[PDB]
Amino acid sequence: TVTEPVGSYARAERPQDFEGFVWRLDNDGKEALPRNFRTSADALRAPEKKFHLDAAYVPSREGMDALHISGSSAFTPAQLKNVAAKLREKTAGPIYDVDLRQESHGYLDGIPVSWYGERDWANLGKSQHEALADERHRLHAALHKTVYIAPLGKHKLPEGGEVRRVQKVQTEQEVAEAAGMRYFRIAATDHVWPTPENIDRFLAFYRTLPQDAWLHFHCEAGVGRTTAFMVMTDMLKNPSVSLKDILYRQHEIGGFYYGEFPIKTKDKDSWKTKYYREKIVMIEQFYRYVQENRADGYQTPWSVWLKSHPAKAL
């Protein structure tokens, strides 16, 4: 019938095809803050043209001051400290570093890096555990080793960079704890909608949070996956507001825009189209999930609910 239901198109891809091959530089550290740093309490800004949105429209801000959420890109330990210091001014509640990265990542001599593979799919198809297992080993194996760490440029291949003998090896968790942030990991594969597993995990985590918890989501670039969860929490926590208000709202503060829009990639990025389209349909299904489990505390697992309310492709 359906080998892969809408929302799992990525399962049809072959892991053995995007294995890691270089340590990517996640952030060079020139900035005091990570890229795309945004807060739920920020003021809404002008939309991006590409998204063909109505700049004259004014989204509700209902529940945003209480949403208590932030997003951003990968960071250097110093930057996490700046982020945390900055969030502390807005809460006496514990600040979580919600790592949404499935790809193996950590710090080498304080330098943020990750094991990069084609399409950042070096851990594609792995269970969360296997994913983190790879992370620990890859990281630990670098200690006292001569590594090549590089940024990506043309064609997403290494370009320039540096080579050194790692003396200190750190884990996101270690850096975050040290920054005074609680750590929570959700290994979501890059460019695609999160698996029902990723979302179940988040739901379970969401339900347990202290009323005054501040969530700082972040992926590699801080746009795709990170906006995904900022949008989910927004709905989850403020189910009164409209799909439109939240999508618009989450975008106008610095996030990606999760509504239909003239998708226009380049010949070399054509593979991404179906994934942008799959995401657009799945944010819409998550909204529906919420409205339907609003009454309870979202006690019904999303994965189970998805199987009996499959999404139609659009």
Q: Is 272 annotated as a binding residue?
A: yes
Return d(Cα 303, Cα 198) in angstroms, integer.
Answer: 9
**Whether residues 65 and 213 fall in one domain:** yes
Query: In units of Å, what resolution does this entry have?
Result: 2.5
- Give 134's DSSP letter: H
Helices and strands (DSSP H and E) totals, the chain: 9, 11
Residues in the chain: 314
**Whether residues 66 and 120 fall in one domain:** no
CA triple 236-48-269, angle to 5 deg? 90
**Whether residues 291 and 152 fall in one domain:** no
Instruction: Judge whether 147 and 23 are in contact, CB under 8 Å.
Output: yes
Q: Is 224 annotated as a binding residue?
A: yes
How would you classify the pairing of strands 182-188 and 95-101? parallel
Q: Is 207 annotated as a binding residue?
A: no
**Whether residues 35 and 88 fall in one domain:** yes
Last residue of a domain, one of 137, 154, 170: 170
How many angstroms separate the most distant Cα atoms in the chain? 56
Phi/psi region, residue 208 (left: phi>0; alpha: psi -120 to 50; beta: rest), is: alpha
**Whether residues 211 and 289 fall in one domain:** yes
Return d(Cα 91, Cα 68) in angstroms, integer.
Answer: 8
Sequence-ordered strand ranges (E) for the chain: 20-25, 38-39, 69-72, 95-101, 105-108, 111-117, 146-150, 162-165, 169-170, 182-188, 214-218
**Whether residues 268 and 175 fall in one domain:** yes
Q: Is 314 exposed, middle or buried (0-12, 13-18, 19+ CB in 10 A)?
A: exposed
Residue with tokens 């750590």: 183
Q: Is 126 annotated as a binding residue?
A: no
**Whether residues 130 and 211 fall in one domain:** no
* Nearest in space to 131 (alpha carbons), one of 224, 72, 197, 180: 197
CATH code at position 11: 3.30.70.1690
Q: Is 144 annotated as a binding residue?
A: no
Last residue of a domain, one of 121, 148, 170: 170
Gyration radius of the chain's alpha carbons:
19
Last residue of a domain, one of 170, 190, 221: 170
Label each residue of 275-307 as H, E or C: HHHHHHHHHHHHHHHHHHHCCCCCCCCHHHHHH
**Whether residues 108 and 96 fall in one domain:** no
Q: Is 220 annotated as a binding residue?
A: yes
Q: How many domains does the chain have?
A: 2
* Nearest in space to 188 (alpha carbons), one of 202, 174, 171: 202
Alpha helices by DSSP H, 69-127: 77-88
CATH code at position 39: 3.90.190.10
**Whether residues 46 and 144 fall in one domain:** no
* Nearest in space to 94 (alpha carbons), one of 34, 207, 174, 177: 177
Experimental method: X-ray
**Whether residues 152 and 275 fall in one domain:** no
How would you classify the pairing of strands 214-218 and 69-72? parallel
Long-range own/partner contacts, residues 306-310 (CB < 8 A, 24 or more apart): 306/5, 306/7, 306/196, 307/5, 307/196, 309/285, 310/5, 310/6
Q: Is 93 annotated as a binding residue?
A: no
Coil, helix or strand at residue 266: coil
- Write phi, then psi, for 275 (nearest 5 degrees): -75, -35
**Whether residues 38 and 180 fall in one domain:** yes
Segments forming the whole domain that contains residue 18: 1-28+103-170
**Whether residues 272 and 189 fall in one domain:** yes
Q: Is 222 annotated as a binding residue?
A: yes
Q: How far is CA 100 from CA 47, 104, 229, 273, 313, in A?
A: 25, 11, 9, 22, 25
